Amino acid sequence: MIVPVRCFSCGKVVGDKWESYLNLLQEDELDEGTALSRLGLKRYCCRRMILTHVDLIEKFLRYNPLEKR
């Protein structure tokens, strides 16, 4: 679903870094290792929270019962 607000192990706020992360991969064409280190994630517990997130909310939102089609 949506990005976790905090990291499970450390407790850093991580939820503000998911849209920043997808732009470092798309626009700047960084690899995942450089993109996580420019976001300021450097404990590997805090790295895997953004590195490994699936983001299924984009797949749930297509099933909207409140709008036509």
């Binding site: 192990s9 290792g33 590997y44 517990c45 790295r47």
Partner: protein, 57 residues
Amino acid sequence: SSRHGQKGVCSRKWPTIDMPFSETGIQPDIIINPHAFPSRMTIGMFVESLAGKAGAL
């Protein structure tokens, strides 16, 4: 359970206050006893542990 047949019941939810902490500052999310390894011989979990930490870095 992990992906190696190492299932386990959650026996106690242990506070971060008194869980062991690393040089990095990390408290682990799950503690598994090393006495669950010698009779099960699930060595795929030992190599997953260092493969997964290499990938997070």
